[PDB]
C-alpha cells in the first residue's frame, strides 16, 4: 500500500525505420556491454510505424543527433508500487490521475510494472495519491518519507498472432547475442503485426516476441511459464506525444483481467491471455458505441 518514486530520469525517443543503421552502434553497446555505460534504465519497443527507446540521461548522451531522431520535451519520472494485481493498480492509479487531466505512460515487465509521469506535474501526483499510498522518495538508496505537505474515440484493431513473454539469465546473453541481432537489425530490411519488446531495468531482462520468432532460439535457455500459455494483442492508435492508456485501462477496470500495458510514441497496447479474448472484444466494442 506504498508508493515509491525512483531516481531514474528518462528520455523518450522515436527513431525512423530506415535510419536504424545510423544508431546501431550505441544500441548494441547498451544492449550487450553494460560495463561500457552508466545506463540503468533501458527499454526498446519495435512497431511498424517507428521505433521507441526509453533511456536515462547517461545513455542519452551517447546518441548522435540527426533528423531521423525525434526527442520529446519532457523529463519523465518513475513510480513503483509495493505491498495488488493489474486490475488493482490500474483502478487505484490510472483513473484518478486521468480525472485531473494529466498524461501517464505505462511500461510493464515480467517482474514488475512501471509508471511514467511528467516532471512538472509531480505536485498533482502527491496531492491525489496521498489518501491511499504512503509516498516515499528514494534519495541515495534510502526511502525518505514524504510528509503530506499542506499544498492547497479511436478505432480498435486486433492482430491475429500469438505472443510469448519470457525472461533470460543475464549470464547467458553472450550465447544468444548473434541470434538476437538478426531479429533486431537484419530481418526488417493487415491481419498481422510485427511486434518486439526488449527492456533492461536494474539488472533484469524482459522480452516480448511472437511465437513465430520463438522457434529460432534454443528452448532450454528461455524461461517462460511451464504450461505454455500464449497471449493476444489489442491496440488503439492516435496522435504522437489526456493520454491514451486511459481509454483502454478504464473500460478494462470494470472487470478483473491481467493486462500488460505497453505505451509507444503513437500506439497504446495491451495483452490478454488467449482464453479471455471474446470478452475484451465485448467490453471494448460495446464501450465504443456509447
Amino acid at each position: 500500500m506504498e508508493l515509491h518514486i525512483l531516481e531514474h530520469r528518462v528520455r523518450v525517443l522515436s527513431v525512423a525505420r530506415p535510419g536504424l543503421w545510423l544508431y546501431t552502434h550505441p544500441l548494441i553497446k547498451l544492449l550487450f556491454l553494460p560495463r561500457r555505460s552508466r545506463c540503468k534504465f533501458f527499454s526498446l519497443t519495435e512497431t511498424p510505424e517507428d521505433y521507441t527507446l526509453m533511456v536515462d540521461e547517461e545513455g542519452f548522451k551517447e546518441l548522435p543527433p540527426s533528423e531521423f531522431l525525434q526527442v520529446a520535451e519532457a523529463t519523465w519520472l518513475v513510480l513503483n508500487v509495493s505491498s495488488a494485481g493489474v486490475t488493482k493498480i490500474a483502478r487505484s492509479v490510472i483513473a484518478p490521475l486521468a480525472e485531473h487531466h494529466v498524461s501517464v505512460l505505462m511500461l510493464s515487465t515480467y517482474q514488475t510494472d512501471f509508471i511514467l509521469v511528467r516532471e512538472q506535474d509531480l505536485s498533482v501526483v502527491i496531492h491525489t495519491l496521498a489518501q491511499e499510498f504512503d509516498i516515499y522518495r528514494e534519495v541515495g538508496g534510502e526511502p525518505v518519507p514524504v510528509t503530506r505537505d499542506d499544498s492547497s474515440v479511436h478505432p480498435i484493431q486486433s492482430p491475429q498472432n500469438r505472443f510469448c513473454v519470457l525472461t533470460l539469465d543475464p549470464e547467458t546473453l553472450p550465447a544468444i547475442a548473434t541470434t538476437l541481432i538478426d531479429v533486431l537489425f537484419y530481418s526488417h530490411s493487415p491481419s498481422s503485426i510485427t511486434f518486439f519488446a526488449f527492456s533492461l531495468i536494474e539488472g533484469y531482462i524482459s522480452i516480448v516476441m511472437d511465437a513465430e520468432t520463438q522457434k529460432k532460439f534454443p528452448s532450454d535457455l528461455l524461461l517462460t511459464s511451464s504450461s505454455g500459455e500464449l497471449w493476444r494483442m489489442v491496440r488503439i492508435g492516435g496522435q504522437p506525444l489526456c493520454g491514451i492508456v486511459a481509454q483502454i485501462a478504464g473500460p478494462l477496470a470494470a472487470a478483473d483481467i491481467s493486462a500488460y500495458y505497453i505505451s509507444t510514441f503513437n500506439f497504446a497496447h495491451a495483452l490478454v491471455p488467449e482464453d479471455g479474448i471474446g470478452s475484451v472484444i465485448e467490453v471494448l466494442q460495446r464501450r465504443q458505441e456509447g
Partner: protein
C-alpha cells in the same frame, strides 16, 4: 562457486559440487601406501561415486532422514528442484523418490534450499522475483508435482532460508 557438504550421519563421507557431483570417503591411512588425494599428512580420500547428469546447478541440501541415506536435493537454474540419489544400495524401503521434478508455475532462478529438523518431509525453496508469483514455497516429498503446501511471499525475492529449531 563450488561448495562442500558433510554427510549428516556418516563420519567418513562428503561431496564436492563444482560442475558435477562426486562422493568421497575419508580413508584414514598414514602408516600405509597411498594408493586417492592428499588431504593431510595422515588421511586420504577416495572417489566412491560420481554423477554429471545436470547442467547449471545452483544449490544442494543433504537429506536428514536415515533409510535412503544419499538423497540430494539439487536446485537447478530454471526453477525446478530434482531429488538425486548417489548411492548403490538399490531397493530400499523408499524406491519411489529417486528422482522427482518440483516445478513452480513460472520459471525463475533458484537461490536457496532448506530442510526441517523436526519433520524431514518438508523442503523450503526460495526463488527470484515475479509479478504474479509466490517466492517462498514449502513442498511435501510424499512435471510430476505442481501443488506445494504453504505458499508465502507474493511479489518479492528471497535470498536465504533458515528453519528455526524451536
Amino acid at each position: 562457486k563450488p561448495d562442500i557438504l558433510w554427510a549428516p550421519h556418516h563420519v567418513d563421507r562428503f561431496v564436492v559440487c563444482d560442475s558435477e557431483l562426486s562422493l568421497y570417503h575419508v580413508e584414514s591411512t598414514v602408516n600405509s601406501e597411498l594408493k586417492s588425494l592428499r588431504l593431510s599428512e595422515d588421511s586420504a580420500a577416495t572417489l566412491l561415486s560420481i554423477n554429471s547428469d545436470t547442467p547449471y546447478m545452483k544449490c544442494v541440501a543433504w537429506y536428514l532422514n536415515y533409510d535412503p541415506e544419499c538423497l540430494l536435493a539439487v536446485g537447478q537454474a530454471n526453477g525446478r528442484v530434482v531429488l538425486t540419489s548417489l548411492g548403490q544400495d538399490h531397493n530400499s524401503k523408499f524406491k519411489d523418490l529417486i528422482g522427482k521434478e518440483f516445478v513452480p508455475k513460472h520459471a525463475r532462478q533458484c537461490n536457496t534450499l532448506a530442510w526441517n529438523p523436526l519433520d524431514s518431509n518438508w523442503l523450503a525453496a526460495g526463488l527470484d522475483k515475479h509479478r504474479a508469483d509466490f517466492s517462498v514455497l514449502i513442498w511435501d516429498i510424499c512435471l510430476l508435482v505442481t501443488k506445494p503446501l504453504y505458499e508465502l511471499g507474493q511479489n518479492d525475492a528471497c535470498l536465504s532460508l533458515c528453519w528455526l529449531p524451536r
